[PDB]
Scaffold this active site. Structure first.
Site, PDB file in Angstrom:
ATOM      1  N   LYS D 155      46.615  44.422  37.684  1.00 55.19           N
ATOM      2  CA  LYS D 155      45.612  44.583  36.636  1.00 55.19           C
ATOM      3  C   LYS D 155      44.228  44.810  37.223  1.00 55.19           C
ATOM      4  O   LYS D 155      43.480  45.666  36.747  1.00 55.19           O
ATOM      5  CB  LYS D 155      45.595  43.360  35.727  1.00 55.19           C
ATOM      6  CG  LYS D 155      46.849  43.132  34.941  1.00 55.19           C
ATOM      7  CD  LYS D 155      46.636  42.037  33.938  1.00 55.19           C
ATOM      8  CE  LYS D 155      46.246  40.758  34.611  1.00 55.19           C
ATOM      9  NZ  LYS D 155      47.391  40.141  35.308  1.00 55.19           N
ATOM     10  N   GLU D 181      37.845  34.454  36.022  1.00 54.17           N
ATOM     11  CA  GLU D 181      38.582  35.074  37.113  1.00 54.17           C
ATOM     12  C   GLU D 181      38.181  34.448  38.444  1.00 54.17           C
ATOM     13  O   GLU D 181      37.477  33.443  38.492  1.00 54.17           O
ATOM     14  CB  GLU D 181      38.359  36.584  37.114  1.00 54.17           C
ATOM     15  CG  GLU D 181      39.598  37.334  37.481  1.00 54.17           C
ATOM     16  CD  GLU D 181      40.725  36.987  36.567  1.00 54.17           C
ATOM     17  OE1 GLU D 181      40.465  36.838  35.366  1.00 54.17           O
ATOM     18  OE2 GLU D 181      41.862  36.823  37.046  1.00 54.17           O
ATOM     19  N   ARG D 182      38.653  35.036  39.535  1.00 53.87           N
ATOM     20  CA  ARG D 182      38.268  34.581  40.860  1.00 53.87           C
ATOM     21  C   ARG D 182      36.840  34.998  41.172  1.00 53.87           C
ATOM     22  O   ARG D 182      36.438  36.126  40.893  1.00 53.87           O
ATOM     23  CB  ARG D 182      39.214  35.146  41.912  1.00 53.87           C
ATOM     24  CG  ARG D 182      40.667  34.959  41.582  1.00 53.87           C
ATOM     25  CD  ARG D 182      41.533  35.638  42.602  1.00 53.87           C
ATOM     26  NE  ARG D 182      42.938  35.307  42.443  1.00 53.87           N
ATOM     27  CZ  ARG D 182      43.724  35.840  41.521  1.00 53.87           C
ATOM     28  NH1 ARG D 182      43.238  36.723  40.677  1.00 53.87           N
ATOM     29  NH2 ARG D 182      44.995  35.493  41.444  1.00 53.87           N
TER      30      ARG D 182
HETATM   31  N1  LIG Z   1      47.518  50.512  42.735  1.00 52.61           N
HETATM   32  C1  LIG Z   1      48.020  49.646  43.846  1.00 52.61           C
HETATM   33  N2  LIG Z   1      48.311  50.185  45.023  1.00 52.61           N
HETATM   34  C2  LIG Z   1      48.771  49.429  46.034  1.00 52.61           C
HETATM   35  N3  LIG Z   1      48.949  48.149  45.916  1.00 52.61           N
HETATM   36  C3  LIG Z   1      48.679  47.536  44.774  1.00 52.61           C
HETATM   37  C4  LIG Z   1      48.185  48.319  43.664  1.00 52.61           C
HETATM   38  N4  LIG Z   1      48.009  47.432  42.650  1.00 52.61           N
HETATM   39  C5  LIG Z   1      48.362  46.219  43.099  1.00 52.61           C
HETATM   40  N5  LIG Z   1      48.733  46.348  44.318  1.00 52.61           N
HETATM   41  C6  LIG Z   1      49.179  45.237  45.120  1.00 52.61           C
HETATM   42  O1  LIG Z   1      49.523  44.080  44.238  1.00 52.61           O
HETATM   43  C7  LIG Z   1      48.543  42.998  44.660  1.00 52.61           C
HETATM   44  C8  LIG Z   1      48.027  42.325  43.467  1.00 52.61           C
HETATM   45  O2  LIG Z   1      47.102  43.204  42.856  1.00 52.61           O
HETATM   46  P1  LIG Z   1      46.068  42.613  41.691  1.00 52.61           P
HETATM   47  O3  LIG Z   1      45.027  43.694  41.352  1.00 52.61           O
HETATM   48  O4  LIG Z   1      45.328  41.387  42.236  1.00 52.61           O
HETATM   49  O5  LIG Z   1      46.940  42.231  40.343  1.00 52.61           O
HETATM   50  P2  LIG Z   1      46.533  41.122  39.219  1.00 52.61           P
HETATM   51  O6  LIG Z   1      45.085  41.245  38.880  1.00 52.61           O
HETATM   52  O7  LIG Z   1      47.342  41.369  38.000  1.00 52.61           O
HETATM   53  O8  LIG Z   1      46.821  39.717  39.745  1.00 52.61           O
HETATM   54  C9  LIG Z   1      47.452  43.691  45.329  1.00 52.61           C
HETATM   55  O9  LIG Z   1      46.838  42.833  46.333  1.00 52.61           O
HETATM   56  C10 LIG Z   1      48.088  44.806  45.997  1.00 52.61           C
HETATM   57  O10 LIG Z   1      48.634  44.313  47.252  1.00 52.61           O
HETATM   58 MG   LIG Z   2      43.070  40.107  39.267  1.00 50.74          MG
END
Ligand SMILES: Nc1ncnc2c1ncn2[C@@H]1O[C@H](COP(=O)(O)OP(=O)(O)O)[C@@H](O)[C@H]1O
Ligand SMILES: [Mg+2]
Ligand SMILES: Nc1ncnc2c1ncn2[C@@H]1O[C@H](COP(=O)(O)OP(=O)(O)OP(=O)(O)O)[C@@H](O)[C@H]1O
Ligand SMILES: Nc1ncnc2c1ncn2[C@@H]1O[C@H](COP(=O)(O)OP(=O)(O)OP(=O)(O)O)[C@@H](O)[C@H]1O
Ligand SMILES: [Mg+2]
Ligand SMILES: [Mg+2]
Lengths: 486, 187, 81, 470, 35, 470
Positions: D155, D181-182
């Site tokens: 997200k 959030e963080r």
């Molecule tokens: N578009 C992307 N391309 C490559 N890796 C991704 C992508 N989106 C997420 N990831 C991987 O999944 C992990 C979690 O992403 P994150 O943005 O923090 O999701 P959320 O906000 O839902 O917790 C990321 O650190 C990354 O390693």
């Molecule tokens: Mg996040």
């Protein structure tokens, strides 16, 4: 103007505990000093629990609360057609006041056993799958149940748009006035719906009762009963109304909020003990009157959103128990290309053929039997080429009839053209055609029969049936167009 | 044992003890005497040493009820008031006492037919119109009631007067009048 | 877990339907290896329906328990007021 | 104005007794005798001239009898173009160490939603440059979007890529609201906005306003910070007519914050332990995030879905407030496909042939149909294996796997996660590439040629290179 | 329940994934060498 | 007095309803007449709800409670290094007092957005699967989640033992002071743990905060915050700390008991409404500081025990949505021989390759890709060689250059002829070989951070001549 009053002892979360008001009635509408309204839901020995029709930041401890002496009522009449109103009937479309003459209480009792007659007249939706396999009659309560974004509001809107052919005509017996109650929706979603109904010229015979997501829980709770009273006006005066509650899940949620805040004992899923009573007394008001009572009717189309297809939840269980049948929608069928995504195996109409014209009865009995056999042998697709000729024929006819049921959005069909297409289907005149073309054929053929064959369509429409002359003429038209089709 | 219920009801601990005492006093036709005795016992209650000793939570209820017992015997009260105070001390509701007292008080507030009615105005209105409203209002009453007026003055209503006769409520203020006219203007 | 049990029920009902259809196809083609396939897929469908019956019992138990646990949470939260 | 005293402190809930002048509900009250500014928002009138309030900061060190002053209004935050490039918290204080925010007007964070006659029906596609979004569930200008996903499905990465593309292509005062959030992600976003030039610490041409209340805040701050960001965006929409972008991450936290005080406000829990007022609170907040006839607000909201449920009351209630949901799946992220958008669960109200054109609509429906057929064939593949499939069905499975890979895309913000370069695919290139895969024009190319490419010319070049190597 | 067997995990969903990957890595090999 | 002093109204289950104490603050530490301490958590009109930090057998109705005037706080400093303390900072290792000069509140606020900076330096655990595929940087929150007896405490103790190579060197930038918080554990488990740490000589730079199963629920609730304050001392003085909360499930249980006995209404599974806040306000205090603030860091490794693999439960979902990544340990993998039983398909590190040395970055990219492709088709033999290369003995954490060396010897092909059952054997021998003769190459790779073509070729000959000799 001498008025009986009370004081707000406390206020919070839209519940006002009020001192005094010794003579207020249960479910009586009161008025706060802010101008806000309320309804007395809890009459307790030392306080009255008022639910607030608005924002409680306007109500303070010590504010004066007046009685009005009246149970909640709404304006009814024909002056409401083409208007967008709120749950209490105030115009919210900026087109001026509602010039109604009559008011009706929102909590009147349904007609009894004797004022009713059987549901026998069709309520045409314009959707081939509904009108053929899950027929709806005038006076019925047919549930539209399904997951999110599966096409339920579209079924309601096609049913509303379809009634233009009857409402522009002169047959007063077949006119259907529509009412769309929107509970807990965005205001922009309702504005899109109102625009869609205006473009289709469907507003002149439609009322839109709108209790949206930012409206207080009492208003969302009351909006179905307001709309039902507006439709009971027509049901009582020899006319026919249809009402769509979109949707009753959100009304149940609003009522649960009001109840939990009034400290009423919670039950399963925190719903109060009388949430069944809520929906049942709303839905038993859709009736068909006998000729001694004018012959009018009210058809209810409640909508229910299930979570992950779970029809064993509390509120789906209740409303499935209350209604006369269900139109179940699937998301897998939606993404398979089957749209309207009606699940024919699960859908049911306990009125049934008594709500069909004889022509649709003719073709629809055959179509139902054939699709049932198809459903029985349908798992053997992926292997069907390795079975009998009879099983391959069942699969062939089944997929032809499946593609024959697909239909575009906002394009409801007349019953004569539906009958013509189902005739071409269940008589065999599409077996030699391959599936990827059926829909295409269905379109072109339709245009053909609309252009050069108004006599046959008009004669079926006037007769209600396919007589032998009609049958043979249809046979000839179908075979000619098929032989000459690309 | 059938009760003699008062004309107005009070609820809670205050209401229960006040209703019990009203019923007990009406059976012996001692209502006015018990009233005067509760007025006196409440004003005794508000004594600072006595309030400090009665609200204290670590004092044993035995010593506390003995203290209330002897300090009621120092007054020569009716048996009804004495038994009421001992019942409140024995149950540990002494903190509610004055509440109970006022409850009983407000009970007999309507027993004498005294109808409470407050007239809010913009600026303090003089006594001529006040006796005028005295007479024109005591027409609002049934058999044998007398007015308790409390003329309040808040100018934020900038005119007229808001009259609260018991639970009846008439709004002769000019703010509601002009707002009603304005709502008719906009609606 | 109710969601685990629902996933597994769906998977095994699907396996049952597929093996049933494969059995019917084999019993058509049987008009030595084809009879062996017919019996193998018949036994696979029997075992699948057995597992489906056990899993349906487990599913019903688990959903009744989930409804009761949520009711008890709501009742305990309301009795603390 | 009026002065009261603290009489009870239980967690994040504080009771205040006013002798004169009880404040209305939703008023902001300031606690007297504290080092930093502590604000309590009135929530209930308890009777006996006591009000129950939710604290906007910590309640440690509060004393019974401590003086509380009534401000006479809800929380009022500074609004205006001076908020651009600044970070404020829930109560409008600047938390960027850059000095006070000298706006000329303040707005209360509680307002009424726009009326029904103020709605606009205009639906215009907003091209993001992301293949799966534009193809299957395109966003609209002035619409509400919503990105659903469990923990760790992407997200934040998707919302940051949307910020990147749209906000740097946009000309209308973005606003970002970090809701529970963080804080690490807040610092990251702040700095990749400074180095992006979107925030300018000097020569004030900044075009983003930041509002932040993170995980370490009490429940009250996390429940009101979304309203603070909303109020900034609302000033930009109404009093300036501009077209605003509103990014909210994460909106679930808003709802969750309410839960954390609900029982302490004396409320019987509803289902799944949520407040009895979940739907109406969500309504009165979300109905203000909208395009009116006075201005436009495109809003992208990241919506946490607890435990990948989507039937939990919070996401399930959010679904009906959006125009174009993007549902991220863990089953798709574990295939390695990013973004993890679920094609058979994402929706858009402008996925209408009369809006996107019949070619776009037909391509989208064909992609969704072949993916559903791939699903239906995978059971048969599990039992009978692959070699016993029909030829039409092997073709279906081949084109379906190719379409799955082609919906994947390398992001400019994920250049560290992938090592790849960012690609921004135009709309007609997306429609054309998927039409060509559905037609069979690339049956001869391998499937790893479509993994993480932009337009289809890149798939062809990748196939040629993958062959030229081996 | 169209992808119920591979959305459930377990032996019948993991073996399906392995079979698909085997077949299509074979086909991608016999498709790249023919380029 | 009744303003600085109160009297116990009632005592039971470790909760004391106190009369008086009019001036007591929220979360202030009070002292009973028996010498016990307590925390004032409920300030109510008629009483104070005090949670007792000990055994309420000694508190009687009518006891005198006095104020301290101080919100709960613990000793901090370096004097705590090598000591075993309880939740309130009192030493329990039988070595006398801790000569601490500084006290720090346990409920402080996490740093904001401005004082932070991106996570750049690596936190070396010494575990090939972690250091390779789920890397951790200083300032990150990495959750260790799993069922019982899957190997979570092992990972934490390997991590603490690894930092001895850095702590005994010279460069103060790579030193990491560890803190192990034992919550609700058996006291002999903590004695065993302190033994493993002292034998490996890891206790000189470690603090152990012990709130074991017989300690009062307030102490187990309060111990993670005490450990966090002891670590924030290092984080705010330019030093780097690492803290392990083993585990937060038991802290949530202690908090639930404490809250249910204060008559606060229960939420889901009777947990209080704000248990998410309970863990979020704690895990947000692990942060990386910018150079204006010293540049120190605090890395958090929370531990969560799931019931029968239900990561969809309440508390695991909370802590999964808080942290920056999770190490998933499974029992299925544990019994198949995969030790440490890290599920790579589920293990995430939201910081990624930014928290990694460049050499390990290079070799671990290839390892991650090959292991993903192997998890797809289960080349098969290469994936088997690599998965056996991930396995590791307990309490044997490797240096980063040796991890790079073995990942290289497995990922460039130098194991594709060897027998799987011999791989492990080969491995250890290989390492001995290098660590006996090639300290120059290893010092080179360590000091350079990356592998030059000179180093690449040098260890080319190294591994080739060895694999010939083996
Ligand atoms: N578009 C992307 N391309 C490559 N890796 C991704 C992508 N989106 C997420 N990831 C991987 O999944 C992990 C979690 O992403 P994150 O943005 O923090 O999701 P959320 O906000 O839902 O917790 C990321 O650190 C990354 O390693
Ligand atoms: Mg996040
Ligand atoms: N017969 C159809 N043909 C093509 N598309 C359709 C058809 N019916 C519905 N749709 C589309 O499917 C989508 C969902 O339909 P719809 O909004 O009417 O269902 P819903 O159940 O009311 O959704 P919601 O949960 O928002 O209330 C819509 O975008 C609609 O345009
Ligand atoms: N990498 C490993 N190699 C060999 N044995 C291991 C490894 N990791 C753990 N073990 C062993 O598996 C067992 C798991 O114990 P451990 O304390 O590390 O896991 P845990 O999740 O903390 O269990 P608990 O519920 O007792 O806290 C231990 O006996 C440990 O010795
Ligand atoms: Mg709908
Ligand atoms: Mg352990």
């Amino acid at each position: 103007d001498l008025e009986e009053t009370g004081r707000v002892l406390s206020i919070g979360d839209g519940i006002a505990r009020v001192h005094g008001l010794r003579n207020v009635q249960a479910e009586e509408m009161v008025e706060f000093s802010s101008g806000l309204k309320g309804m007395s839901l809890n009459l307790e020995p030392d306080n009255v629990g008022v639910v607030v029709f608005g924002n409680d930041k306007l109500i303070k401890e010590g504010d004066i609360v007046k009685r009005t002496g009246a149970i909640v009522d709404v304006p009814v009449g024909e002056e409401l057609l083409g208007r967008v109103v709120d749950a209490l009937g105030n115009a919210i479309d900026g087109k001026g006041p509602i010039g109604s003459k009559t008011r009706r209480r929102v909590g009147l009792k349904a007609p009894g056993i004797i004022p009713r007659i059987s549901v026998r007249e069709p309520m045409q939706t314009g959707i081939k799958a509904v009108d053929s396999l899950v027929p709806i009659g005038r006076g019925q309560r047919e549930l539209i149940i399904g997951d999110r974004q599966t096409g339920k509001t579209s079924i309601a809107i096609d049913t509303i748009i379809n009634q233009k052919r009857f409402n522009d005509g002169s047959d007063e017996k077949k006119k259907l006035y529509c009412i769309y109650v929107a509970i807990g929706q965005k205001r922009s979603t309702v504005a899109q719906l109102v625009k869609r109904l205006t473009d289709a010229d469907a507003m002149k015979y439609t009322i839109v009762v709108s209790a949206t997501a930012s409206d207080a829980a009492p208003l969302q709770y009351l909006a179905p009963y307001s709309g039902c009273s507006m439709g009971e006006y027509f049901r009582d005066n020899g006319k026919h109304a249809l009402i769509i509650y979109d949707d009753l899940s959100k009304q149940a949620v609003a009522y649960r909020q009001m109840s939990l805040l009034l400290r009423r004992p919670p039950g399963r899923e925190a719903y109060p003990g009388d949430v069944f009573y809520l929906h049942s007394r709303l839905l038993e008001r859709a009736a068909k009157m006998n000729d001694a009572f004018g012959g009018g009717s009210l058809t209810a189309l409640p909508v229910i959103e299930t979570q992950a297809g779970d029809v064993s939840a509390y509120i789906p269980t209740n409303v499935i128990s209350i209604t006369d049948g269900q139109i179940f929608l699937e998301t897998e069928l939606f993404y398979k290309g089957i749209r309207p995504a009606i699940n024919v195996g699960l859908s049911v109409s306990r009125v049934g053929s008594a709500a069909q014209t004889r022509a649709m009865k003719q073709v629809a009995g055959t179509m139902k039997l054939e699709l049932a056999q198809y459903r029985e042998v349908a798992a053997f697709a992926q292997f069907g080429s390795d079975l009998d000729a009879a099983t391959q024929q069942l699969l062939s006819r089944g997929v032809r009839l499946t593609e024959l049921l697909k239909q575009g959005q906002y394009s409801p069909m007349a019953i004569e053209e539906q009958v013509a297409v189902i005739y071409a289907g269940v008589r065999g005149y599409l077996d030699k055609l391959e599936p990827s073309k059926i829909t295409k054929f269905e379109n072109a053929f339709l245009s053909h029969v609309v252009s050069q064959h108004q006599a046959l369509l008009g004669t079926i429409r006037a007769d209600g049936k396919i007589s032998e002359q009609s049958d043979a003429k249809l046979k000839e038209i179908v075979t000619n167009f098929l032989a000459g089709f690309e | 044992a059938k009760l003699v219920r008062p004309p107005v009801q009070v609820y809670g601990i205050e209401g229960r003890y006040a209703t019990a005492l009203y019923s007990a006093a009406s059976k012996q036709n001692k209502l006015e005497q018990v009233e005067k005795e509760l007025l006196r016992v409440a004003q005794i209650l508000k004594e600072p040493k006595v309030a400090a000793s009665v609200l204290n939570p670590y004092v044993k209820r035995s010593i506390k009820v003995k203290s209330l017992n002897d300090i009621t015997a120092k007054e020569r009260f009716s048996p009804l008031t004495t038994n009421l105070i001992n019942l409140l001390a024995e149950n540990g509701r002494l903190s509610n006492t004055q509440g109970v007292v006022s409850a009983f008080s407000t009970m007999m507030s309507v027993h004498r037919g005294e109808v409470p009615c407050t007239v809010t105005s913009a600026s303090p209105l003089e006594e001529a119109t006040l006796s005028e409203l005295k007479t024109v209002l005591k027409s609002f009453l049934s058999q044998g009631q007398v007015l308790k007026l409390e003329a309040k003055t808040d100018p934020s209503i900038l005119g007229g007067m808001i009259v609260r006769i018991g639970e009846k409520y008439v709004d002769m203020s000019v703010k509601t009048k002009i707002q009603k006219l304005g709502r008719a203007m906009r609606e | 877990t109710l969601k685990d049990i629902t996933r597994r029920l769906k998977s095994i009902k699907n396996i049952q339907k597929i093996t049933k259809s494969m059995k019917m196809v084999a019993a058509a083609k049987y008009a030595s290896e084809q009879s062996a396939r017919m019996t193998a897929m018949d036994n696979a469908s029997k075992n699948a329906s057995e597992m489906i019956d056990k899993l349906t019992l487990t599913f019903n138990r688990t959903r009744q328990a989930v409804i009761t646990k949520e009711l008890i949470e709501i009742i305990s939260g309301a009795a603390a007021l | 104005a009026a002065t009261g005293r603290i009489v009870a402190v239980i967690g994040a809930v504080v009771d205040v007794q006013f002798d004169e002048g009880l404040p209305p509900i939703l008023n902001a009250l300031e606690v007297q005798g504290r080092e930093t500014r502590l604000v309590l928002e009135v929530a209930q009138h308890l009777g006996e001239s006591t009000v129950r309030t939710i604290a906007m900061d910590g309640t440690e060190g509060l004393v019974r009898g401590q003086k509380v002053l009534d401000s006479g209004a809800p929380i009022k935050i500074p609004v205006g173009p001076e908020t651009l490039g600044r970070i404020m918290n829930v109560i409008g204080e600047p938390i960027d160490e850059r000095g006070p925010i000298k706006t000329k007007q303040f707005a209360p964070i509680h307002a009424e939603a726009p009326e029904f006659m103020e709605m606009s029906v205009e639906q215009e596609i907003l091209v993001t440059g992301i293949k799966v979004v534009d193809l299957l569930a395109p966003y609209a200008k002035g619409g509400k979007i919503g990105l659903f996903g469990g923990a760790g499905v992407g997200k934040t990465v998707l919302i940051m890529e949307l910020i990147n593309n749209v906000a740097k292509a946009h000309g209308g005062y973005s606003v970002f609201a970090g809701v529970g959030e963080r804080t690490r992600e807040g610092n990251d976003l702040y700095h990749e906005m400074i180095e992006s030039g979107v925030i300018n610490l000097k020569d004030a041409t900044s075009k983003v306003a930041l509002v932040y209340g993170q995980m370490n805040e009490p429940p009250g701050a996390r429940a009101r910070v979304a309203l603070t960001g909303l109020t900034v965006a609302e000033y930009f929409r109404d009093q300036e007519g501009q077209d605003v972008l509103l990014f909210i991450d994460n909106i679930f936290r808003f709802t969750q914050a309410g839960s954390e005080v609900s029982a302490l406000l004396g409320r019987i829990p509803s289902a799944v332990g949520y407040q009895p007022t979940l739907a109406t609170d969500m309504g009165t907040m979300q109905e203000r995030i909208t395009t009116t006839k006075k201005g436009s607000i495109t809003s992208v909201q990241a919506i946490y879905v607890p435990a990948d449920d989507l039937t939990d009351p919070a996401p399930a209630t959010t679904f009906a407030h959006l125009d174009a949901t993007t549902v991220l799946s863990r089953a798709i992220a574990e295939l390695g496909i990013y973004p993890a958008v679920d094609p058979l669960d994402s929706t858009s109200r402008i996925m209408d042939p009369n809006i996107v054109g019949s070619e776009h609509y037909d391509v989208a429906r064909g992609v969704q149909k072949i993916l559903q057929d791939y699903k239906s064939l995978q059971d048969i593949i599990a039992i009978l294996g692959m070699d016993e499939l029909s030829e039409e069905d092997k073709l279906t499975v081949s084109r379906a796997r190719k379409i799955q890979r082609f919906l994947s895309q390398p992001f400019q913000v994920a250049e560290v996660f992938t090592g790849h370069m960012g690609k921004l695919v135009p709309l007609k290139e997306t429609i054309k590439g998927f039409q060509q895969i559905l037609a069979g024009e690339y049956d001869h190319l391998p499937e790893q040629a479509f993994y993480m490419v932009g337009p289809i010319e890149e798939a062809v070049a990748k196939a040629d290179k993958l062959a030229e190597e081996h | 329940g169209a992808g119920s067997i591979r959305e459930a995990g377990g032996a019948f969903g993991k073996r399906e994934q392995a079979e698909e990957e085997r077949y299509f890595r074979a086909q991608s090999r016999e498709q790249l060498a023919a380029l």
